[PDB]
């Protein structure tokens with residue numbers, strides 16, 4: 001399937017979008033989940049599971065569609 005393909009891509013839309021969206025309130029917590037998402041993948045290599053990151057991020061990415 002992908003697993004990582006979903007992690008490598010989302011990381012681009014995750015930050016780039018928020019960095020270009022510039023907002024507050026809803027964006028305040030939105031970034032909190034972002035900084036943690038980028039640090040997990042870039043750092044994780046053997047542990048943490050790749051399927052666990054693509055599933056969780058699914059919530060963040062979907063949130064970008066609105067913002």
Ligand SMILES: *Sc1ccc(O)cc1
Pocket residue numbers: 014015016018019020030031034035038
């Ligand atoms: S990951 C990320 C990047 C930029 C923001 O403004 C927020 C989250």
